[PDB]
Ligand binder design. Sequence first.
Ligand code: CLA
Ligand code: CLA
Ligand code: CLA
Ligand SMILES: CC(C)=CCC/C(C)=C/CC/C(C)=C/CC/C(C)=C/CC/C(C)=C/CC/C(C)=C/CC/C(C)=C/CC/C(C)=C/CC/C(C)=C/CC1=CC(=O)C(C)=C(C)C1=O
Ligand SMILES: CCCCCCCCCCCCCCCC(=O)OC[C@H](CO[C@@H]1O[C@H](CS(=O)(=O)O)[C@@H](O)[C@H](O)[C@H]1O)OC(=O)CCCCCCCCCCCCCCC
Ligand code: HEC
Ligand SMILES: CCCCCCCCCCCCO[C@@H]1O[C@H](CO)[C@@H](O[C@H]2O[C@H](CO)[C@@H](O)[C@H](O)[C@H]2O)[C@H](O)[C@H]1O
Ligand SMILES: CCCCCCCS[C@@H]1O[C@H](CO)[C@@H](O)[C@H](O)[C@H]1O
Ligand SMILES: CCCCCCCS[C@@H]1O[C@H](CO)[C@@H](O)[C@H](O)[C@H]1O
Ligand code: OEX
Ligand SMILES: [Ca+2]
Ligand SMILES: [Cl-]
Ligand SMILES: [Cl-]
Lengths: 137, 51, 51, 36, 334, 97, 37, 30, 50, 33, 34, 243
Amino acid sequence: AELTPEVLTVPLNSEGKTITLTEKQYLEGKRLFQYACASCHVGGITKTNPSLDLRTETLALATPPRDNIEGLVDYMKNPTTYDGEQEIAEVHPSLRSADIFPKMRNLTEKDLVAIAGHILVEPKILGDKWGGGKVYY
Amino acid sequence: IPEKLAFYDYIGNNPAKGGLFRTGPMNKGDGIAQAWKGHAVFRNKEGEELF
Amino acid sequence: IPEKLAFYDYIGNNPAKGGLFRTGPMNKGDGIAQAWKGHAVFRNKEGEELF
Amino acid sequence: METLKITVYIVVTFFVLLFVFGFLSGDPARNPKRKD
Amino acid sequence: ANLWERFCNWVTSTDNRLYVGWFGVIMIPTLLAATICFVIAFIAAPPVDIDGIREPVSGSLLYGNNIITGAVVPSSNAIGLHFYPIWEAASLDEWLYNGGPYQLIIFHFLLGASCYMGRQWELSYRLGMRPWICVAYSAPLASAFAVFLIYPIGQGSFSDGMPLGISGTFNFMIVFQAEHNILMHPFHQLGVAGVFGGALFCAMHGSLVTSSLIRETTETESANYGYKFGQEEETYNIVAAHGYFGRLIFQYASFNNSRSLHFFLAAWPVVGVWFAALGISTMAFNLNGFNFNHSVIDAKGNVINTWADIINRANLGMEVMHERNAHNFPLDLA
Amino acid sequence: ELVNVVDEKLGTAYGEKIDLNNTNIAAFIQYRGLYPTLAKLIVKNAPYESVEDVLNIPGLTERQKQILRENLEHFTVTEVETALVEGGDRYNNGLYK
Amino acid sequence: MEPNPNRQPVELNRTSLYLGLLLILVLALLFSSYFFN
Amino acid sequence: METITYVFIFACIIALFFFAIFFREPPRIT
Amino acid sequence: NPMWRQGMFVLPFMARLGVTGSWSGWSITGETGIDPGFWSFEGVALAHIV
Amino acid sequence: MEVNQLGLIATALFVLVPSVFLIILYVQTESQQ
Amino acid sequence: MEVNQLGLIATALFVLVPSVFLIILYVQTESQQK
Amino acid sequence: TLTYDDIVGTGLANKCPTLDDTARGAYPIDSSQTYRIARLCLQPTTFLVKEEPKNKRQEAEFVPTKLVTRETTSLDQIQGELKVNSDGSLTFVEEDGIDFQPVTVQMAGGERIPLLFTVKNLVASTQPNVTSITTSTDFKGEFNVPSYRTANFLDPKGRGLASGYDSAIALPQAKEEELARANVKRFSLTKGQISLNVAKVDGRTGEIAGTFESEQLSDDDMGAHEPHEVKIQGVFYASIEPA
Ligand code: CLA
Ligand code: CLA
Ligand code: CLA
Ligand SMILES: CC(C)=CCC/C(C)=C/CC/C(C)=C/CC/C(C)=C/CC/C(C)=C/CC/C(C)=C/CC/C(C)=C/CC/C(C)=C/CC/C(C)=C/CC1=CC(=O)C(C)=C(C)C1=O
Ligand SMILES: CCCCCCCCCCCCCCCC(=O)OC[C@H](CO[C@@H]1O[C@H](CS(=O)(=O)O)[C@@H](O)[C@H](O)[C@H]1O)OC(=O)CCCCCCCCCCCCCCC
Ligand code: HEC
Ligand SMILES: CCCCCCCCCCCCO[C@@H]1O[C@H](CO)[C@@H](O[C@H]2O[C@H](CO)[C@@H](O)[C@H](O)[C@H]2O)[C@H](O)[C@H]1O
Ligand SMILES: CCCCCCCS[C@@H]1O[C@H](CO)[C@@H](O)[C@H](O)[C@H]1O
Ligand SMILES: CCCCCCCS[C@@H]1O[C@H](CO)[C@@H](O)[C@H](O)[C@H]1O
Ligand code: OEX
Ligand SMILES: [Ca+2]
Ligand SMILES: [Cl-]
Ligand SMILES: [Cl-]
């Protein structure tokens, strides 16, 4: 098995436009996800709120939908609760809250696209292990 | 009648009713006493008290 | 199916299910076998056979 | 419990004082060879 | 002579059947208190709420244990590292419920054993010996400190100290693996090399000396009668011993200097056991065994399991089951 | 007299749908738009005599009522089971991942 | 310690062993039924 | 009965420690 | 269910001379919440073993 | 038969304890000079 | 506790038989002409 | 007026606030206003357990017990609506608070009796015509006593109600009928009763204090055995406010 362009092709938006990420993009995404996110989301779960994971099916049912690059990038700028009702930047890492979450301070649009792409590619590789928690280790 | 008084008026508590090799507590024979059943009065058809 | 054949197909007769200090006959554990209950077939609400 | 506490404190102090004054009582000289 | 001087003379006397000594003055009462409380508690103590969840665990014989399952159970998690002597309890009943015996026992034992080690220094000085037998004993002493004191301190509770019982010891070991992956820790690995190596060199040395005893007895007598306590001459031929072992491996792998040999016998198990003790004492502050979980990944990103990942599955079973009513939140953080 | 009431419950609509009177709050994540805002209101305002009484929670917005109607087909109600609702268990039932 | 001059050797001859074993074994044969009861 | 058994064996062991230490065969240089 | 129904042989000798309570809080005459001091049945047993 | 379960240990020690007392005494008599 | 009813006799004989063997041997060694 | 650091470890944190002997006034009830209990505190001083004698005949008595779980027994920070009823009685309806404590006490002879000491869902009412709360006011009410352990709790063999094994797995071929009461866990829910006797009132502040007596069942260990009857006596404190 290989990490192919096919594996690396993920939804850019809800209309089904796709983007084919480069390998450098994938690897940058993994690295940035570790840097900024893995302390709470290692392996696709959420340590401080285990009810919400980063599985693609879960992201799809978020409001607004988060199962695409643009949805994920938007989440990273302005995160909301799962129903879209409350903005949660004060307690969740975002560009809007980089003053209080300093690891978000230097992230570029290309960086967010990369983290988003890691989040969407990882389950294509790992399957139910992604967002599965210890049962799947 | 106190339960305690009735229980003394029972042969299971008489120390001359044992056996040399019937070992252990009195409770092992007739059992652990729980309650007085009450005083039994026997009568025949004529209703005469019998003992 | 002979009851004797069914009985072989039962783990209580497998010699790798015991214990070093579980002493005595096999009958001391699961019991003295009396009768085959018959072959159990499990089905779900759809009627599919399950194992 | 108060009486128990005081008793144990006294006991412990007694032994601890034995240990300390004991080892202060010319301990280096209690060996079979050089005594100064 | 003064009353005090006569007493000091008696305390430090080389002619007492058991040496007393100044360390002995603390050792004797503390060990006796630990021992007496241990034996009464192991026989008769009621169940103890070790995990502070009102779920008392029975450790004593009279409350349904045998030698293997019985224990003096650790003090309550509600207590933590708080000092819980008898007089801090409202009654002996409360003290027993909360695991007071365990604290009394361990603290007297650790003091009394520390003084045992001092006593070994002390008698060696009184007898004109060299002083370092106490240094060899510091290895098992340090290990007792690791499990009864340093581990509880690091984890914030005596409820996590090793129980004083055989099955309770196994419980401690299994939970420790789940929480520290101790098997994968190089100091525990050094501990094992120390005790397996200690046992190997014990058998080796015994067999080599026994192999080379000088003939001093007839066939119908135990060879042990060929040695008389206090004889000046050596009772075996170390040259013959060396001649055998040097050829068994190669000449340079063998000791013919008995002093170097006996030093090695001391140092190998003692150093290994110091490292075992330091394993427990540093896993106490959660610097844990090597973690190679999902370390090996294929070209696509699939995890290719190794034996480390199989270990991890066993550790998970231990983790999710232990103290099954104690955790309300998702991480076991102590 | 001896039955496990939680297993029994599994044989009712509780075992098929989100039971507005019993089910732990995290179940509302299975459908778009229910968690956390409507989930909190639903648990807070239980029990319901019928699924459609969920539309009557005081202070629901008009959009909330519409989201609720869209999800009635995934809801049920059964008798409140003490074992499932005591202990704050509808808000945290001791299960994480 | 100086030796105690009151010490004496003890003996049980073979006949005594046999008589004694017979007493014990026959007492056991007699009393065992009552012990099992 | 089990408890008695375990305590009995234990007690015998402590008794043995006493005799082994205080009534040992004394070491003698010859 | 008094002591003499239960095969008790030494208990009545302790009781005869005034030891009637346990450290665990009961007394031979059926009381609760008593404090016997040291000289309970258990204290007497321990004294004899010492 | 529902016998007393202590009958076996009572019988076994009744035999063994005095028998072994006797055997000990006999054997050390034989071993005397 | 519902322990095995042979555990008492097994433990007793386990202790007694070999201990008696050693006692026999020790006493007849002591009684040998010294 | 003390800080945490003045209090920590003294035992005082398990004690309800008290009122001075001078607090024998009257707290006016304005039938037009809405009211709340902003703080109810209950501090048990005695746990009694009813004995279970061998023949029903002779009334069984409540006997004193020894607390083994330390100063962890008080209920506090409890609040709720204080209604004024048509007849001028007041009804306290408990909404929330630290309204339960597990407690273990010990009978003479050692038997341990765990209980969930609680006023959960208390509804308690005074006499009619309480124009002012005074040292003559009483509250009498009922409350719920859920199972001491909740549904996830697993026994030492791993059996439970909402989780766990449903059989004695160490006895794989044992007949199951004789173990049904241990194997099939059940969740109790029973009623308790409490009376609060007001002994002190500060008419100015709206604080009241007094003694209480409640009666409730102890732990049944998820249906494994019969519960015991418990009587808890202690002191209480409440602060009343316009809502
Ligand atoms: C004065 C002595 C004495 C007395 C009156 C008692 C009385 C009692 N005991 Mg205690 N007891 C004693 C000493 C005594 N005990 C001793 C020394 C011990 C340690 C062994 C015990 C340990 C003990 C236990 C562990 C228990 C009792 C129990 C009891 C009760 C039942 C007794 C029973 O069943 O006897 C049965 C008596 C017999 C079967 C008679 C034995 C006759 C012997 C075997 C005859 C031997 C003949 C000999 C071999 C012939 C030699 C012939 C040769 C010269 C030629 C009773 C209250 C029981 C009780 O209920 O406890 C609560 C119980 O469980 N006792
Ligand atoms: C080859 C030997 C052998 C084997 C394989 C069997 C097999 C069997 N026997 Mg038979 N038996 C034997 C020899 C054997 N027996 C002998 C010699 C006797 C006379 C004592 C018997 C008398 C006997 C009876 C009376 C009964 C059996 C029964 C049985 C069955 C159950 C066995 C059991 O529960 O074991 C349990 C085994 C153990 C608990 C293992 C013992 C381990 C020992 C104690 C370890 C000792 C360790 C040592 C001290 C360490 C030293 C250390 C030191 C060097 C440092 C089984 C079919 C039972 C049955 O069902 O009959 C119908 C039954 O009632 N047997
Ligand atoms: C400090 C010493 C002391 C004290 C206060 C006790 C106290 C007790 N013992 Mg213990 N005991 C002791 C030492 C003591 N004992 C010693 C040293 C032994 C070993 C021999 C024992 C062996 C023992 C046994 C075997 C038993 C007790 C029991 C008891 C209890 C009942 C006592 C009783 O009925 O006596 C009754 C005593 C007598 C009736 C004395 C008879 C006196 C005779 C007739 C004297 C005749 C000679 C004299 C010189 C005649 C001339 C006198 C002159 C005035 C004219 C009581 C709690 C009983 C118990 O409950 O155990 C748990 C029990 O069974 N004790
Ligand atoms: C079919 C065909 C082809 C056949 C041909 C066969 C043939 C003829 C071959 C010949 C050619 C040939 C030799 C080939 C070699 C092939 C080969 C390399 C095979 C592998 C062999 C191999 C890996 C062997 C392992 C060797 C090994 C691990 C040895 C142990 C070394 C070791 C760790 C020792 C412990 C270290 C150490 C210093 C220990 C001392 C501690 C100790 C024992 C103290 C006790 C002690 C010591 C004393 O000293 C004396 C005095 C006394 C008192 C005493 O207490
Ligand atoms: C990056 C590179 C940098 C590397 C630096 C690494 C730092 C590590 C420090 C290591 C150096 C220390 C060496 C000390 C030598 C010594 O002990 O001398 C003391 C004696 C003297 O040797 C004896 O020598 C004697 C002469 S004399 O004493 O030396 O004068 C002679 O008489 C005798 O025959 C001979 O046997 O040495 C011996 O007795 C030989 C025994 C073999 C080695 C024993 C020591 C280690 C054992 C412990 C291992 C524990 C680990 C296992 C855990 C389970
Ligand atoms: C802990 C302090 C966190 C860190 C660091 C990051 N996230 Fe997070 N995340 C956290 C929580 C508690 C939640 C749930 C918040 C809520 O109330 O809803 C989340 C949620 C998300 C989601 C939504 C998942 C869904 O299924 O809808 C996403 C997509 C997400 N987080 C992404 C994300 C990224 C990319 C992060 C690094 C830049 C990151 N999170 C950090 C807790 C924490
Ligand atoms: C489980 C039941 C156990 C029952 C155990 C019974 C214990 C029996 C103890 C008997 C001990 C006999 O004690 C033994 O007596 C003999 C003589 O008889 C002594 O022997 C002494 O006299 C003999 C004979 O003149 C000399 O040869 C010998 O050199 C001298 O030591 C032993 O030194 C002593 O150990
Ligand atoms: C070796 C055991 C030492 C323990 C002693 C505990 C003493 S405790 C003491 O005992 C007295 C007995 O008369 C009572 O009067 C007193 O009220 C009680 O508190
Ligand atoms: C040397 C004796 C020391 C052992 C004392 C044991 C505690 S005392 C013991 O406690 C039990 C439970 O509280 C009671 O049931 C029992 O009746 C009582 O004797
Ligand atoms: O206490 Mn004994 O054990 Ca050390 O982790 Mn946390 O806490 Mn409990 O859990 Mn896992
Ligand atoms: Ca009043
Ligand atoms: Cl555990
Ligand atoms: Cl937790």
